[PDB]
Amino acid sequence: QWSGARALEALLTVAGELRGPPLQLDTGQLLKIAKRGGVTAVEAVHAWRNALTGAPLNLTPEQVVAIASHDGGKQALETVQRLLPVLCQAHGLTPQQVVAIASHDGGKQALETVQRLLPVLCQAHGLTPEQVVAIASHDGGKQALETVQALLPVLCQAHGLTPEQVVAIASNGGGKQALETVQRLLPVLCQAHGLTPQQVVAIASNGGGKQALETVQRLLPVLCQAHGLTPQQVVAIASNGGGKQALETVQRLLPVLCQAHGLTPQQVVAIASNSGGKQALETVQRLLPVLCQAHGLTPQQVVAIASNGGGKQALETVQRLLPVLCQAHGLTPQQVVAIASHDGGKQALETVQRLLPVLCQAHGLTPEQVVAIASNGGGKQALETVQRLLPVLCQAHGLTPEQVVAIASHDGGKQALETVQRLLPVLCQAHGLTPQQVVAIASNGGGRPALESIVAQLSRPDALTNDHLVALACLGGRPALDAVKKL
Amino acid sequence: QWSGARALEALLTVAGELRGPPLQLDTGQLLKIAKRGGVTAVEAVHAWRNALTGAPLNLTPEQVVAIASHDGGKQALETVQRLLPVLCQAHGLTPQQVVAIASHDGGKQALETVQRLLPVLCQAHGLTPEQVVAIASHDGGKQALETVQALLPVLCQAHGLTPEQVVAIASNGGGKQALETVQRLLPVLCQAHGLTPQQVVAIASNGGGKQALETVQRLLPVLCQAHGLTPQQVVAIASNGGGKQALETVQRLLPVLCQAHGLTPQQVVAIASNSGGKQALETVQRLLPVLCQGLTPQQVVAIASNGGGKQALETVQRLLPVLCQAHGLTPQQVVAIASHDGGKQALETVQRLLPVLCQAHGLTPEQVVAIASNGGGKQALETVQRLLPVLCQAHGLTPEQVVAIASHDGGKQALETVQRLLPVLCQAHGLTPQQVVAIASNGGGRPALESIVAQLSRPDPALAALTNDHLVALACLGGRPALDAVKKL
DNA sequence: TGTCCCTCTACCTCCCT
DNA sequence: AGGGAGGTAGAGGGACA
DNA sequence: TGTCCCTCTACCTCCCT
DNA sequence: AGGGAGGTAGAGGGACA
């Protein structure tokens, strides 16, 4: 038992012993933990399983896995056992919040720092607990929290930022570095022919952090003069994680991609202005000719695919799957492009390849309906949810397949479907809506909160007729309903 | 013999000729041009009168009077005939926009500068033509336009203002001075005194902005330490035309008013926080004991606490007795009429029109008082006199409905718009007269009606999911702003 | 003087909830 | 509907050709 | 090498026109 | 209907130890 067994041997032994309660974990979940937490975390999960799952902690297996699967995972598991009770009982944090803080590399450090600093940050006229939890819920959360403590005063007093803007900058991986760099570079960047303070805060708040701010300082003059970009365009490229990489790649590839009958600067900016913009741009360079020759695409289509986050993944997946999808599944290049042209296009394409037969045969949808569901951000999520909920929505709530498809065919389709499942009964039976009206409300981006907002208004109102509320919900969803409140 | 006699005689001669076609100007119009544009303006109107009135320009006589009635009016008249076509074709401006630009001292300079700078302001600076027209449409518009061109970058970048805030500052007489002063004083007022950029923009965003900004810098310390005013109260006093005068008068009279009459600092600040705040404060000091020896202190404060405070106080002193005696009003009613911007105008108009509205139109004194008891009450009262017969006889409204439309700020505008749009909303789109009256019976009645007519006349996609009844409920709830927000969906 | 620009006061209308 | 904001008219001073 | 921190990439949902 | 904004999970690697 106690022994000098090798690393894999130790891992597999623990795996053997984790087949059952309270912590039943498959090799997959064990792989997830091990990639980051290592065999160390797996052994820690094994050692502490009963206390983690038992009272007063009451963590689900899902929460335990989430804490364990990070660098230092063993340390975070030990620390949550000690500090969760403390943070919840003495500071009124929820377990969800504590788990959120714990589930990042170095979670031990973040938890101990929230314990130490929450009392000083949340004094009168200070931060809310929610803001502290948000800052802490990233890798290096300890560093970000200590740096907010230090620099909140100078950033607000000397540089004129609001505490909310400071929290926004701090609430990213490498937040400490972003805060220190804003402090240093604000005066430099914000001069005539420079940036606005708003643009500096945006770059510092959007993921790209210190590196993006430093690269804009470095490259703004040459990008805006020799390369002819606007400061707005430069800020758009800078305002994602990896902004530095996209900026440098634009510098290098603008001369290459914008020659006669190539791309325009505006096309290049659109490709670069997403997370992974460097990868998207390099992949466009590599694959534009071959996608156009081999699969009959046009440059405009290639650019369209590339102009979303994960553009590299979508282009490579089009290269790989367009033939399979057209030949075996009967889709057209246009339909394949349509599915590919959203964030997560790779995920949607692979899910269409996998689920299209099942959806057309067993559930009776047409390929066109499947394409329609797939052709939105999170298309994979919406396709899988249609597969899951179509029969129950049609049988128990009496919807038609066409109505289910309409609910699903928008960004957040998964959320809207699940919310229709939840709320259709109360909306119809308690407030006299028809399923038609519920479907109409749900059949837009932001379908979920539109439904939630209308159920809430119909339950405890602050007028406007119910049909008028429904029309507003359809027109503008939750934001429409909230606009009416302020009237 | 007197030197100015030849010019005056020249003036009266040409003036007589302008009473004929194609302008048929009246006495008031002629005095106005002579007073503000001088003899060169009156002569210019005569010389250009044919070129301006018909094809191509087709300006109305009142438009010609608007352009002529400013220093350099002669210059502006010449420039408008020359540049109006160039600005309507080269930049897509309307004639009404060109006339608005021309209708200020130095309108020539503004027109020429709009011609020269509009492209660069809209292209390189991102401003819209509407924003350029607004900046241009003040005395010294040329200076404001040039300064916006020169300073928009440094103000947005080095000072963190939005382009909208810069336009707001520029869109006042003396815009150039306000912009240059904001550039210099923004860091000082924010960092030394804790003001937000928003507050500084608000101080700068009035006529005499520069003066108010420099006075806040000078007096903020003294006012907040000695007198116990807060930065917010100082900003509030500063945030009007003549802000400087108001602030300096507050320093002088705060203690005097508080000791001798027992006002609080709160009441003093309220009196000071209008256009003419200086005059209001000084008048409260000399008149309060006179009024109260009678009215209560609290009533005097209420009257004083609106723009034109001095005028209303003085008018109440003069008319309080004759209105209560001859016209059977109470002191509380006279105070109510007086306690709005333009109180003096409303009081004098009540004195003139109460007997007429009562006898000729069958209104009650209470209805007359209700119409008068809003800002622009004079205008609403005069419009009721004019339009009550046509609204009732031609459009089927009851006197009660007409009084309801009239009894809000902008009542004149609402009444005229109802007269104008009632038939189209009812006959063409099937609104009931009661629905039209409901939309009109709020502040902003006019624009709410126009927004509603706009939708049902050229059906915009956004407003389509909303039925006429829903649109009516929205228009009544939040007027043009609500309708406009819906359009944005 | 004629013109341009700036400041102050009074008055009117619409907005924001 | 109550305080707040945004706008136009009118008049006078400084400045200067 | 485990722990911590930072940087970069990919994916999902909702908002705003 | 087509971007814009904001949120998350996950991979890789440097520093340190």
Side-chain angles (χ1 to χ4, degrees), chain A residues 306-353:
Chain A
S307 291
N308 302 100
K312 171 178 167 193
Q313 301 304 314
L315 287 172
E316 287 178 352
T317 307
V318 168
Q319 176 183 29
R320 194 172 88 254
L321 295 185
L322 186 144
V324 189
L325 289 172
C326 292
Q327 252 265 18
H329 301 284
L331 307 180
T332 65
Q334 301 100 282
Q335 287 175 321
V336 173
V337 167
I339 298 164
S341 295
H342 308 269
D343 286 13
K346 166 179 174 189
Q347 303 301 316
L349 284 163
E350 292 179 348
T351 302
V352 163
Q353 178 190 25

Coordinates of all heavy atoms in Angstrom, one line a residue, chain A residues 306-353:
Chain A
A306 N -12.4 32.7 -41.7 CA -11.3 33.1 -40.9 C -11.7 34.3 -39.9 O -10.9 34.5 -38.9 CB -10.2 33.6 -41.7
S307 N -12.7 35.0 -40.1 CA -13.0 36.2 -39.3 C -13.8 35.9 -38.1 O -14.5 36.8 -37.5 CB -13.8 37.2 -40.2 OG -12.9 37.8 -41.2
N308 N -13.7 34.7 -37.5 CA -14.3 34.4 -36.2 C -13.2 33.9 -35.3 O -12.1 33.5 -35.8 CB -15.4 33.4 -36.4 CG -16.5 33.9 -37.3 OD1 -16.6 33.5 -38.4 ND2 -17.4 34.7 -36.7
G309 N -13.4 33.9 -34.0 CA -12.5 33.3 -33.0 C -12.4 31.8 -33.4 O -13.4 31.2 -33.9
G310 N -11.2 31.3 -33.3 CA -11.0 29.9 -33.7 C -11.0 29.7 -35.2 O -11.1 28.6 -35.7
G311 N -10.8 30.8 -35.9 CA -10.7 30.8 -37.4 C -9.7 29.8 -38.0 O -10.0 29.1 -39.0
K312 N -8.6 29.6 -37.3 CA -7.7 28.5 -37.7 C -8.3 27.2 -37.7 O -8.3 26.4 -38.6 CB -6.4 28.5 -36.9 CG -5.5 27.3 -37.1 CD -4.3 27.4 -36.3 CE -3.5 26.1 -36.2 NZ -2.5 26.1 -35.1
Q313 N -9.0 26.9 -36.6 CA -9.7 25.6 -36.4 C -10.8 25.4 -37.5 O -10.9 24.3 -38.0 CB -10.3 25.5 -35.0 CG -9.2 25.5 -33.9 CD -8.1 24.5 -34.1 OE1 -8.4 23.3 -34.4 NE2 -6.9 24.9 -34.0
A314 N -11.5 26.4 -37.8 CA -12.6 26.3 -38.8 C -12.1 26.1 -40.2 O -12.6 25.2 -40.9 CB -13.5 27.5 -38.7
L315 N -11.0 26.8 -40.5 CA -10.4 26.6 -41.9 C -9.8 25.2 -42.1 O -10.0 24.6 -43.1 CB -9.3 27.7 -42.1 CG -9.7 29.1 -42.3 CD1 -8.5 30.0 -42.2 CD2 -10.5 29.2 -43.6
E316 N -9.1 24.8 -41.1 CA -8.5 23.4 -41.2 C -9.6 22.4 -41.2 O -9.4 21.4 -41.9 CB -7.5 23.2 -40.0 CG -6.2 24.0 -40.2 CD -5.3 23.8 -39.0 OE1 -5.7 23.2 -38.0 OE2 -4.1 24.3 -39.1
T317 N -10.7 22.6 -40.5 CA -11.8 21.6 -40.5 C -12.6 21.6 -41.8 O -13.1 20.6 -42.2 CB -12.7 21.9 -39.2 OG1 -11.9 21.9 -38.0 CG2 -13.8 20.8 -39.1
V318 N -12.7 22.8 -42.4 CA -13.3 22.9 -43.7 C -12.5 22.1 -44.7 O -13.0 21.4 -45.5 CB -13.5 24.4 -44.2 CG1 -13.8 24.4 -45.7 CG2 -14.5 25.1 -43.4
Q319 N -11.1 22.3 -44.6 CA -10.2 21.6 -45.5 C -10.4 20.1 -45.4 O -10.5 19.4 -46.4 CB -8.8 22.0 -45.2 CG -7.8 21.3 -46.1 CD -6.4 21.6 -45.7 OE1 -6.1 21.9 -44.6 NE2 -5.5 21.5 -46.7
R320 N -10.6 19.7 -44.2 CA -10.7 18.3 -43.9 C -12.0 17.7 -44.2 O -12.1 16.6 -44.8 CB -10.4 18.0 -42.4 CG -10.1 16.6 -42.0 CD -9.6 16.5 -40.6 NE -10.8 16.4 -39.7 CZ -11.2 17.4 -38.8 NH1 -10.5 18.5 -38.9 NH2 -12.2 17.2 -38.0
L321 N -13.1 18.4 -43.8 CA -14.5 17.8 -43.9 C -15.4 18.2 -45.0 O -16.4 17.6 -45.2 CB -15.2 18.1 -42.5 CG -14.5 17.4 -41.3 CD1 -15.4 17.7 -40.0 CD2 -14.3 15.9 -41.5
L322 N -15.0 19.3 -45.7 CA -15.9 19.7 -46.8 C -16.2 18.6 -47.8 O -17.4 18.4 -48.1 CB -15.3 20.9 -47.5 CG -16.2 21.6 -48.6 CD1 -16.1 23.1 -48.6 CD2 -15.9 21.0 -50.0
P323 N -15.2 17.8 -48.2 CA -15.5 16.7 -49.1 C -16.4 15.7 -48.5 O -17.4 15.3 -49.2 CB -14.1 16.1 -49.4 CG -13.1 17.2 -49.1 CD -13.8 18.0 -47.9
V324 N -16.1 15.2 -47.3 CA -16.9 14.2 -46.6 C -18.4 14.7 -46.5 O -19.3 14.0 -46.8 CB -16.4 14.0 -45.2 CG1 -17.1 12.8 -44.6 CG2 -14.9 13.7 -45.2
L325 N -18.5 16.0 -46.1 CA -19.9 16.5 -45.9 C -20.7 16.7 -47.2 O -21.9 16.5 -47.2 CB -19.8 17.9 -45.1 CG -19.4 17.8 -43.7 CD1 -19.2 19.2 -43.1 CD2 -20.4 17.1 -42.8
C326 N -20.0 17.0 -48.2 CA -20.7 17.2 -49.5 C -21.0 15.9 -50.2 O -22.1 15.7 -50.7 CB -19.9 18.1 -50.5 SG -19.7 19.8 -49.9
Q327 N -20.0 15.0 -50.2 CA -20.2 13.7 -50.8 C -21.1 12.7 -50.1 O -22.0 12.1 -50.7 CB -18.8 13.0 -51.1 CG -18.4 13.1 -52.6 CD -18.7 11.8 -53.3 OE1 -19.6 11.0 -52.9 NE2 -18.1 11.6 -54.5
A328 N -20.9 12.6 -48.8 CA -21.6 11.6 -48.0 C -22.9 12.1 -47.4 O -23.9 11.3 -47.3 CB -20.7 11.1 -46.9
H329 N -23.0 13.4 -47.1 CA -24.1 14.0 -46.5 C -24.9 14.9 -47.4 O -26.0 15.4 -47.0 CB -23.7 14.7 -45.2 CG -23.0 13.7 -44.2 ND1 -23.7 12.9 -43.5 CD2 -21.7 13.6 -43.9 CE1 -22.9 12.2 -42.7 NE2 -21.6 12.6 -42.9
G330 N -24.5 15.1 -48.6 CA -25.2 15.9 -49.6 C -25.3 17.4 -49.4 O -26.2 18.0 -50.1
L331 N -24.4 17.9 -48.6 CA -24.4 19.4 -48.4 C -23.7 20.1 -49.5 O -22.9 19.4 -50.3 CB -23.8 19.7 -47.1 CG -24.3 19.1 -45.8 CD1 -23.6 19.5 -44.6 CD2 -25.8 19.4 -45.7
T332 N -23.9 21.4 -49.7 CA -23.1 22.2 -50.7 C -22.0 22.9 -50.0 O -22.1 23.1 -48.7 CB -24.1 23.2 -51.3 OG1 -24.5 24.2 -50.3 CG2 -25.3 22.5 -51.9
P333 N -21.0 23.3 -50.7 CA -19.9 24.2 -50.2 C -20.5 25.4 -49.5 O -20.0 25.7 -48.4 CB -19.1 24.6 -51.4 CG -19.2 23.3 -52.3 CD -20.7 22.8 -52.1
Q334 N -21.5 26.0 -50.0 CA -22.1 27.2 -49.4 C -22.6 26.8 -48.0 O -22.4 27.6 -47.0 CB -23.3 27.7 -50.2 CG -22.8 28.2 -51.6 CD -23.2 27.2 -52.7 OE1 -22.5 26.2 -52.8 NE2 -24.3 27.5 -53.4
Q335 N -23.3 25.7 -47.8 CA -23.8 25.3 -46.5 C -22.6 25.0 -45.6 O -22.7 25.2 -44.4 CB -24.7 24.1 -46.7 CG -26.1 24.4 -47.3 CD -26.9 23.2 -47.5 OE1 -26.4 22.1 -47.9 NE2 -28.2 23.3 -47.2
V336 N -21.6 24.4 -46.1 CA -20.4 24.1 -45.3 C -19.8 25.4 -44.8 O -19.4 25.5 -43.6 CB -19.4 23.2 -46.0 CG1 -18.1 23.0 -45.2 CG2 -20.0 21.8 -46.3
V337 N -19.6 26.3 -45.7 CA -19.1 27.6 -45.3 C -20.0 28.3 -44.3 O -19.5 28.8 -43.3 CB -18.9 28.6 -46.5 CG1 -18.7 30.0 -46.1 CG2 -17.8 28.1 -47.4
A338 N -21.3 28.2 -44.4 CA -22.2 28.8 -43.5 C -22.0 28.2 -42.1 O -22.0 29.0 -41.1 CB -23.7 28.6 -43.9
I339 N -21.9 26.9 -42.0 CA -21.7 26.3 -40.6 C -20.3 26.7 -40.1 O -20.2 27.0 -38.9 CB -21.7 24.8 -40.7 CG1 -23.1 24.3 -41.2 CG2 -21.4 24.1 -39.4 CD1 -23.1 22.9 -41.7
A340 N -19.3 26.8 -40.9 CA -18.0 27.1 -40.5 C -17.8 28.6 -40.0 O -16.9 28.9 -39.2 CB -17.0 26.8 -41.6
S341 N -18.7 29.5 -40.4 CA -18.5 30.9 -40.2 C -19.0 31.5 -38.9 O -19.7 32.5 -39.0 CB -19.1 31.7 -41.4 OG -18.4 31.4 -42.6
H342 N -18.7 30.8 -37.8 CA -19.2 31.3 -36.5 C -18.1 30.9 -35.5 O -17.3 29.9 -35.8 CB -20.5 30.7 -36.1 CG -21.6 31.0 -37.2 ND1 -22.4 32.1 -37.2 CD2 -21.9 30.3 -38.3 CE1 -23.2 32.0 -38.2 NE2 -22.9 30.9 -38.9
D343 N -17.9 31.5 -34.4 CA -17.1 31.0 -33.3 C -17.5 29.5 -33.1 O -18.7 29.2 -33.1 CB -17.2 31.7 -32.0 CG -16.6 33.1 -32.0 OD1 -16.2 33.6 -33.1 OD2 -16.5 33.7 -30.9
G344 N -16.5 28.7 -32.9 CA -16.7 27.3 -32.7 C -17.1 26.5 -34.0 O -17.6 25.4 -33.9
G345 N -16.8 27.1 -35.2 CA -17.2 26.5 -36.4 C -16.7 25.1 -36.6 O -17.4 24.2 -37.1
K346 N -15.5 24.8 -36.1 CA -15.0 23.4 -36.0 C -15.9 22.5 -35.3 O -16.2 21.4 -35.8 CB -13.6 23.4 -35.4 CG -13.1 22.0 -35.0 CD -11.7 22.1 -34.5 CE -11.2 20.7 -33.9 NZ -10.0 20.9 -33.2
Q347 N -16.3 22.9 -34.1 CA -17.2 22.1 -33.3 C -18.5 21.8 -34.0 O -19.0 20.7 -33.9 CB -17.4 22.8 -31.9 CG -16.1 23.0 -31.1 CD -15.3 21.8 -30.9 OE1 -15.9 20.8 -30.5 NE2 -14.0 21.8 -31.1
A348 N -19.1 22.9 -34.6 CA -20.3 22.7 -35.3 C -20.2 21.8 -36.5 O -21.0 20.9 -36.7 CB -20.9 24.1 -35.8
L349 N -19.1 21.9 -37.3 CA -18.9 21.1 -38.4 C -18.8 19.6 -38.0 O -19.4 18.7 -38.7 CB -17.6 21.5 -39.2 CG -17.7 22.7 -40.0 CD1 -16.3 23.3 -40.4 CD2 -18.6 22.5 -41.3
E350 N -18.0 19.3 -37.0 CA -17.8 17.9 -36.5 C -19.1 17.3 -36.0 O -19.3 16.1 -36.0 CB -16.7 17.9 -35.5 CG -15.3 18.2 -36.1 CD -14.2 18.2 -35.1 OE1 -14.5 18.2 -33.8 OE2 -13.0 18.2 -35.5
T351 N -19.9 18.2 -35.4 CA -21.1 17.8 -34.8 C -22.2 17.5 -35.9 O -23.0 16.6 -35.8 CB -21.6 18.7 -33.8 OG1 -20.6 18.9 -32.7 CG2 -22.9 18.2 -33.1
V352 N -22.2 18.3 -36.9 CA -23.0 18.1 -38.1 C -22.7 16.7 -38.8 O -23.5 15.9 -39.1 CB -23.0 19.2 -39.1 CG1 -23.5 18.8 -40.5 CG2 -23.7 20.4 -38.6
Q353 N -21.4 16.5 -39.0 CA -20.9 15.2 -39.6 C -21.4 14.0 -38.7 O -21.9 13.0 -39.3 CB -19.4 15.2 -39.7 CG -18.9 13.9 -40.3 CD -17.4 13.7 -40.2 OE1 -16.8 14.3 -39.3 NE2 -16.8 12.9 -41.1

